[PDB]
Amino acid sequence: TYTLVWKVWILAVTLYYAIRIPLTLVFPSLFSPLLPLDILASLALIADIPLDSRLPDLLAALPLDLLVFALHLPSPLSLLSLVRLLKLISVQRSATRILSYRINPALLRLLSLVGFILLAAHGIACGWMSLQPPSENPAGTRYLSAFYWTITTLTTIGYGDITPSTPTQTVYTIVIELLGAAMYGLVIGNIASLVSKLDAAKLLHRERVERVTAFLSYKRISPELQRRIIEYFDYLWETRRGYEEREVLKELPHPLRLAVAMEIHGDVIEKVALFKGAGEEFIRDIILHLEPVIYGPGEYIIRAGEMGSDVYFINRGSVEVLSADEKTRYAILSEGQFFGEMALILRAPRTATVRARAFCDLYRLDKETFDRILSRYPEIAAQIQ
Amino acid sequence: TYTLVWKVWILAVTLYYAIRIPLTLVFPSLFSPLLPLDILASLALIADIPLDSRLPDLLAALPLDLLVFALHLPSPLSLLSLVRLLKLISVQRSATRILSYRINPALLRLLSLVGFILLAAHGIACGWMSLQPPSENPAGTRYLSAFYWTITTLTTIGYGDITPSTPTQTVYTIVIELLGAAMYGLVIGNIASLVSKLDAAKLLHRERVERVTAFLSYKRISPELQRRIIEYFDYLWETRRGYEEREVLKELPHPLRLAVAMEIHGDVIEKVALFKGAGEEFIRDIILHLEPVIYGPGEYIIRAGEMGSDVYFINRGSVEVLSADEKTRYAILSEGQFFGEMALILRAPRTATVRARAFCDLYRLDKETFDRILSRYPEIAAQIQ
Amino acid sequence: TYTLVWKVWILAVTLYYAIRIPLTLVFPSLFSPLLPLDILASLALIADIPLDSRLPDLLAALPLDLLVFALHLPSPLSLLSLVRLLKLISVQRSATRILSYRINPALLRLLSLVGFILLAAHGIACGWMSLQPPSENPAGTRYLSAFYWTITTLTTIGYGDITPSTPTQTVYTIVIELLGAAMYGLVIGNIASLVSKLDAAKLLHRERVERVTAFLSYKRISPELQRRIIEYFDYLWETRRGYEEREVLKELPHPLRLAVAMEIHGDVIEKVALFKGAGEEFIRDIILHLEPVIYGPGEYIIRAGEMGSDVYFINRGSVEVLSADEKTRYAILSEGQFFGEMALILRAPRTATVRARAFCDLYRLDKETFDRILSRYPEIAAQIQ
Amino acid sequence: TYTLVWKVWILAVTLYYAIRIPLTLVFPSLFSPLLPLDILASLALIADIPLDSRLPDLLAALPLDLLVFALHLPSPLSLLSLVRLLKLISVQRSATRILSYRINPALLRLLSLVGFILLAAHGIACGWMSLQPPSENPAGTRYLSAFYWTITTLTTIGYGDITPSTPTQTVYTIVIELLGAAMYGLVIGNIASLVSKLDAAKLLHRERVERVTAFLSYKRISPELQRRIIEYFDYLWETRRGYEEREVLKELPHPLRLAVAMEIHGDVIEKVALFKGAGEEFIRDIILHLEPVIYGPGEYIIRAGEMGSDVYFINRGSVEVLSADEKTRYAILSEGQFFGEMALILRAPRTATVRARAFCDLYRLDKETFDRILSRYPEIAAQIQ
């Protein structure tokens, strides 16, 4: 955190140079009661790289001012003292990586781009004020006029209240018209890309659901089941934000996928009265094999007397347990609990009727994987007997 | 439907405030013969949330006007009485969800965005009329001039007939030039996204078919078969709008996929003289196993004397039945009917020649799935004997 | 082809109305020596639909002019005689389908959109000329001025040389500023979509290859093999335009896929001295089982003395045949010919060394499919013995 | 490299014509002390095609000037001497292919498009200067004014300081307004496509990882494992730039995939004390079967006493070797080395505990492939005994 404070100090240093250097090139009446901050900030820029694509620090290192002021270089040649301002590309690419995951990275790119567009419109406005006719005017009313002019130019508005006069003004205006049109086109392109990728789980997710509403409106379905389907999609949004568990953690390797599934279902694979005291690898295998299913409120998951193969573990929702006639209530289950256990070791029919109560988010276990990783574990085969 | 009328009442209330508040900030000669609608609408905004991301109703609740009018707050400080207008973000996000599936959701987003762009251009025009030089002018000719100015600014047109005069006008014009350029760029980006996703089944579908026309034009094929292929693609558009049945209902879970297939093929799985009186689960299994195939008009589906494995159920088109010499016509089948039934229980060759008549949309049944879910059903094994 | 001439006649009729109706609404001095073409074109529009989403022909049918001219309807009410011009939407959707595959359909959409944008800018310019102050001016210099104005407006340029004067001009200018901004945004969105999907096999294909050049540049590979790989990608472009045979004809049904593969490899499955005299279905099965492989110039496909399983059929390139010591040349094969035939019936090792000569595009046959569809064909088992 | 110098000479020749021909059409006072470069450059254009979609060289070949100057052709008919400038399309499509892989091809398309947009804005400006009123003005102040005008037009800015005057100027301005709007829309579309495809491995890769951060932020995971996962994604970026080895070289054919894998893992498949002296084909088979796995720093790959099946070859990272009690350190392995060798020939349990040390990038070998291609190699079965 002392290099985070160092990055903050370096950003303040390069900001100071970005605000000062074009202001003392236009106004050479400055820089004289402000050289000490030039010395301190230059030492900061030359001492940052030991505490950290290479020529920005080297070009920022050399004293490109003080030469203008001791040798009185003319107007088109003094301007190379802005070479220190190439360092801002390096500080940009560093600040775009030092804090790239506390917040969204696209909002980071948009704020860095808006910063660069204002800070280059500043330099272009500074160039315009440099090649202006000399006249008495407050350097504020000449910042407001230069900035007003270069926004009239950058925003493709065009009042025409201030126009080029000399040919070398007309050439400077032509060239900054091309760069202004390029930069403003870049601004429109980056904003349309930043707002194109601004909603991802809710956009694609919505599209998916939508792809199913204009269809279920195509089949002319009754509105009760269609609203129930829509409330299903509302549930899976308002629980996992549209994302599928097995397609988020399919872009991971096997050890990392194992660690993520154990961390996600840690006190879940422990919710059970069944996997406690089991082996560590066994738990991983189980997780590497947990399958989620979702029952809406009131759905029949299991009817007592069916064939039945697989065991069910409740994770999030509730459920109720009914007898074979679905008249006598055995119990009512909730998250963390489990049913279908009398189907794995035995080819018996269902012993209780299982109606959903709310949306469930419940895990199921297939028979082949369970009896494969149960034959080799004796202690859970006794935990289940 | 009394909360749909409540949402309509709340939208009318927030619209009234959105039209009134900036009109009484600019013209303080109003609000005096119109306070009663302020009281009624404020009670509506403070009583809506009990009949329903939280600070909009709280900021809308407090009397931010009446303070301007009793204490005569100055021009840059009275303007905080527009804080009630942050409620419109909440009403926007509520009205974008209460009626999101009667119509397309993208047309909904486009209408909400156009509404927000006009209603913010209204506020910016109101700000311009606020910081204008005071002069005698009808408040209509000052709405037409303020709205004409702020559309000249928002539409990057730029006549230059009305320009800033004071420096604080030039700063206000600069800042609303940046916001106008941002909002107009946002308008172009959202319109290009709304018309990019405006045609989906006909765009992607067309592309797919196209990907096959520039290819079949690449192989230099005769036009008769290529037109027949194109009329095939015309048929599958003009029947199911390009969508594949099994990739629309593959984004559903198993119980929902079962319910949708039973609802789609309900009086289809009943069209048969074969699945009536069958089991409920059996029907589901059958559906969970129905496979669609499409024969164009005149195609040979079955020639009598072939080997033959699988049974065919007609769903939509017609077909004709010919004898083994394809000389003596047995019958002619239509939708709902079926052929190939003398191939599942027996390894006999075809008993009739089956020529298509129109485009068919016909269902077929593989042998392994059929004999697997037929061995365990005795009554359909007698229905088929 | 007499309905193609009818569509051409109808397009000429609706074009004539689209050029005439707004020209006689602005200039009522016309229409009097030109009623006969109105009668003929109206009969054409009312007789087209018998030789062919329904209300365009009905609204085009009724005499909405002649009422303006006999009853002298005022300026805001006469304008409903433009209702005939809604027919152009129907003619657009008909002409966008009658010739949708002689040329690309996207170039068709772009030309129809540019046509609609000019033809609506014509109507808006006509509206501007309608609500102009009456003054003496040639109707050409008033078309050039109205069209110049409405392009200055539609192209977000904004000279400001002609501006609204009356309030009802300012409202008309405001409303056509909103529509002009909407239409010009639509133009930018459709052009960016038309040029986004303009290159498909060469864009995606290039990307695929590229995804392999920045990688093979990542592994720091020697340039000879990388250039050979790139010339491989150049070959598969400059032969089949990037498209994979089995992913173009995987979006087809089985009978259509069989017909396309037989048509593609017709005198290919006949190139052989092996499938001639074979069964018709057998040929289809063979095709339904032909597998393409591509050997670059000089590659070793088979070395004599290897194990060898599968037979190879040359389709496009050349190859050479060497002895087991790769010293004595047996022969040299070309397209249409075949090797590896002494590996299917027998588990013998290679009998000749097969070096590629150019890029090959050669077909191979696996052993299980070949011996499965060879056991049931006796005549080819003798053709191969 | 003498045809690379020939392409450079031809580009210089066609550039000279592209700068000269519209300059001598506007100013006919030129061309007289500059005919020799016309003769030399015309000979270069007519002699290029022997040292190299056909009509550009033929249209460039004929003397379309000298006719203007000997017969004094009038203003709308002399202009066909610009027909030589169609050759630039051929030189464009040639220069877009002669150096398409030293640098990115998209940067090439962007530079060619910017070149074509400036070089056509030059011709349109030349047309404007052609149809101007004749007046005394330096041909520089008339290039700055014509170029300033045609950028005011091309950039949708619109000062309105110079406007059409005659009707044939208004028609020329209208037509170049349509082309300017089309070209500027094309510029915005190509820039948004060039910056849309500008980041591919880092964009898609980032998205993939992101698709896993907003999810692992969804499961509310502890930050230590999530940061470790993120540093995993940082490692696989900062090693292979996001690309998967087996999906880069899956778009290759089998001989090319074999050559690339042997070139990538050449002194890798030789790093081993195991595949040296093995067969050439065997090595290829091994490579055609090498599988990469990645262990983070500190992960347990193998615990001594586990079952164990497969052998591991270290490629990049480090690892350490521990005894069965994980108390006594056997050794510590690094890249190029290998473990798990006492699991292939034997069904013994692990003999040493293998903890990762850094991120590994290590290769593993499954048992079935290894014992399949080991049964048929006797010498490596002795190298491993």
PDB file of C-alpha atoms in Angstrom, chain C residues 131-228:
ATOM      1  CA  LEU C 131     -44.979  25.849 -46.309  1.00  0.00           C
ATOM      2  CA  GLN C 132     -42.781  28.491 -47.818  1.00  0.00           C
ATOM      3  CA  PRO C 133     -43.531  32.170 -48.265  1.00  0.00           C
ATOM      4  CA  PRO C 134     -44.899  32.692 -51.782  1.00  0.00           C
ATOM      5  CA  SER C 135     -42.389  34.464 -53.994  1.00  0.00           C
ATOM      6  CA  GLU C 136     -41.352  34.477 -57.621  1.00  0.00           C
ATOM      7  CA  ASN C 137     -38.686  31.833 -58.214  1.00  0.00           C
ATOM      8  CA  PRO C 138     -38.115  29.127 -60.839  1.00  0.00           C
ATOM      9  CA  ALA C 139     -39.352  25.782 -59.596  1.00  0.00           C
ATOM     10  CA  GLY C 140     -35.910  24.490 -60.329  1.00  0.00           C
ATOM     11  CA  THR C 141     -34.224  27.119 -58.279  1.00  0.00           C
ATOM     12  CA  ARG C 142     -36.783  26.238 -55.673  1.00  0.00           C
ATOM     13  CA  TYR C 143     -35.995  22.596 -55.972  1.00  0.00           C
ATOM     14  CA  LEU C 144     -32.331  23.292 -55.667  1.00  0.00           C
ATOM     15  CA  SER C 145     -32.943  25.527 -52.678  1.00  0.00           C
ATOM     16  CA  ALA C 146     -35.374  23.159 -50.982  1.00  0.00           C
ATOM     17  CA  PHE C 147     -33.152  20.164 -51.581  1.00  0.00           C
ATOM     18  CA  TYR C 148     -30.068  22.097 -50.506  1.00  0.00           C
ATOM     19  CA  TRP C 149     -31.852  23.108 -47.345  1.00  0.00           C
ATOM     20  CA  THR C 150     -33.073  19.626 -46.505  1.00  0.00           C
ATOM     21  CA  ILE C 151     -29.647  18.142 -47.113  1.00  0.00           C
ATOM     22  CA  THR C 152     -28.070  20.788 -44.950  1.00  0.00           C
ATOM     23  CA  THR C 153     -30.533  19.603 -42.358  1.00  0.00           C
ATOM     24  CA  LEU C 154     -30.309  15.882 -42.990  1.00  0.00           C
ATOM     25  CA  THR C 155     -26.485  15.865 -43.086  1.00  0.00           C
ATOM     26  CA  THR C 156     -26.012  17.586 -39.666  1.00  0.00           C
ATOM     27  CA  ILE C 157     -23.918  20.260 -41.397  1.00  0.00           C
ATOM     28  CA  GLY C 158     -25.750  23.509 -40.624  1.00  0.00           C
ATOM     29  CA  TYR C 159     -24.684  26.598 -42.504  1.00  0.00           C
ATOM     30  CA  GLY C 160     -27.567  28.663 -41.145  1.00  0.00           C
ATOM     31  CA  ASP C 161     -28.005  30.586 -44.397  1.00  0.00           C
ATOM     32  CA  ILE C 162     -31.692  29.673 -44.413  1.00  0.00           C
ATOM     33  CA  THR C 163     -33.419  29.464 -41.039  1.00  0.00           C
ATOM     34  CA  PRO C 164     -37.017  29.365 -39.806  1.00  0.00           C
ATOM     35  CA  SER C 165     -38.840  32.680 -39.685  1.00  0.00           C
ATOM     36  CA  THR C 166     -42.431  32.202 -38.526  1.00  0.00           C
ATOM     37  CA  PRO C 167     -43.285  30.058 -35.504  1.00  0.00           C
ATOM     38  CA  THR C 168     -44.999  27.483 -37.691  1.00  0.00           C
ATOM     39  CA  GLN C 169     -41.781  27.305 -39.692  1.00  0.00           C
ATOM     40  CA  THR C 170     -39.861  26.886 -36.512  1.00  0.00           C
ATOM     41  CA  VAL C 171     -42.109  24.010 -35.469  1.00  0.00           C
ATOM     42  CA  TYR C 172     -41.844  22.417 -38.907  1.00  0.00           C
ATOM     43  CA  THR C 173     -38.092  22.787 -38.782  1.00  0.00           C
ATOM     44  CA  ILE C 174     -37.945  21.337 -35.278  1.00  0.00           C
ATOM     45  CA  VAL C 175     -40.000  18.326 -36.267  1.00  0.00           C
ATOM     46  CA  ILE C 176     -38.025  17.676 -39.369  1.00  0.00           C
ATOM     47  CA  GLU C 177     -34.873  18.111 -37.357  1.00  0.00           C
ATOM     48  CA  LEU C 178     -35.967  15.256 -35.151  1.00  0.00           C
ATOM     49  CA  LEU C 179     -36.886  13.117 -38.153  1.00  0.00           C
ATOM     50  CA  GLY C 180     -33.713  14.109 -39.979  1.00  0.00           C
ATOM     51  CA  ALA C 181     -31.573  13.181 -37.009  1.00  0.00           C
ATOM     52  CA  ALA C 182     -33.454   9.900 -36.724  1.00  0.00           C
ATOM     53  CA  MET C 183     -33.130   9.083 -40.420  1.00  0.00           C
ATOM     54  CA  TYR C 184     -29.462  10.065 -40.567  1.00  0.00           C
ATOM     55  CA  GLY C 185     -28.753   7.965 -37.494  1.00  0.00           C
ATOM     56  CA  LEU C 186     -30.562   5.123 -39.218  1.00  0.00           C
ATOM     57  CA  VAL C 187     -28.409   5.665 -42.273  1.00  0.00           C
ATOM     58  CA  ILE C 188     -25.231   5.463 -40.227  1.00  0.00           C
ATOM     59  CA  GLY C 189     -26.469   2.355 -38.430  1.00  0.00           C
ATOM     60  CA  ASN C 190     -27.468   0.528 -41.589  1.00  0.00           C
ATOM     61  CA  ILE C 191     -24.246   1.419 -43.378  1.00  0.00           C
ATOM     62  CA  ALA C 192     -22.158   0.184 -40.467  1.00  0.00           C
ATOM     63  CA  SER C 193     -24.185  -3.026 -40.443  1.00  0.00           C
ATOM     64  CA  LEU C 194     -23.956  -3.454 -44.202  1.00  0.00           C
ATOM     65  CA  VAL C 195     -20.217  -3.050 -44.178  1.00  0.00           C
ATOM     66  CA  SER C 196     -19.925  -5.136 -41.033  1.00  0.00           C
ATOM     67  CA  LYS C 197     -21.439  -8.157 -42.787  1.00  0.00           C
ATOM     68  CA  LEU C 198     -19.913  -7.393 -46.207  1.00  0.00           C
ATOM     69  CA  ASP C 199     -16.993  -9.855 -45.910  1.00  0.00           C
ATOM     70  CA  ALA C 200     -17.922 -13.161 -44.324  1.00  0.00           C
ATOM     71  CA  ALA C 201     -15.820 -16.057 -45.654  1.00  0.00           C
ATOM     72  CA  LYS C 202     -12.757 -13.862 -46.010  1.00  0.00           C
ATOM     73  CA  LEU C 203     -13.277 -11.996 -42.708  1.00  0.00           C
ATOM     74  CA  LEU C 204     -14.060 -14.948 -40.356  1.00  0.00           C
ATOM     75  CA  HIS C 205     -11.678 -17.190 -42.391  1.00  0.00           C
ATOM     76  CA  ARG C 206      -8.889 -14.547 -42.148  1.00  0.00           C
ATOM     77  CA  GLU C 207      -9.605 -14.175 -38.376  1.00  0.00           C
ATOM     78  CA  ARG C 208      -9.294 -17.993 -37.952  1.00  0.00           C
ATOM     79  CA  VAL C 209      -5.931 -18.065 -39.842  1.00  0.00           C
ATOM     80  CA  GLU C 210      -4.891 -14.841 -38.006  1.00  0.00           C
ATOM     81  CA  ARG C 211      -5.796 -16.487 -34.638  1.00  0.00           C
ATOM     82  CA  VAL C 212      -3.056 -18.892 -35.787  1.00  0.00           C
ATOM     83  CA  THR C 213      -0.483 -16.378 -36.976  1.00  0.00           C
ATOM     84  CA  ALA C 214      -0.275 -14.277 -33.853  1.00  0.00           C
ATOM     85  CA  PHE C 215      -0.029 -17.587 -32.086  1.00  0.00           C
ATOM     86  CA  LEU C 216       2.620 -19.121 -34.287  1.00  0.00           C
ATOM     87  CA  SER C 217       4.395 -15.813 -33.953  1.00  0.00           C
ATOM     88  CA  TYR C 218       3.945 -16.299 -30.235  1.00  0.00           C
ATOM     89  CA  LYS C 219       5.725 -19.647 -30.194  1.00  0.00           C
ATOM     90  CA  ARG C 220       8.635 -17.984 -32.080  1.00  0.00           C
ATOM     91  CA  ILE C 221       8.595 -20.537 -34.861  1.00  0.00           C
ATOM     92  CA  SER C 222      10.968 -20.669 -37.784  1.00  0.00           C
ATOM     93  CA  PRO C 223       9.599 -18.776 -40.808  1.00  0.00           C
ATOM     94  CA  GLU C 224       9.850 -21.635 -43.294  1.00  0.00           C
ATOM     95  CA  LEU C 225       7.251 -23.803 -41.669  1.00  0.00           C
ATOM     96  CA  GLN C 226       5.111 -20.786 -40.832  1.00  0.00           C
ATOM     97  CA  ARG C 227       5.159 -19.587 -44.432  1.00  0.00           C
ATOM     98  CA  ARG C 228       4.303 -23.104 -45.509  1.00  0.00           C
TER      99      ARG C 228
END
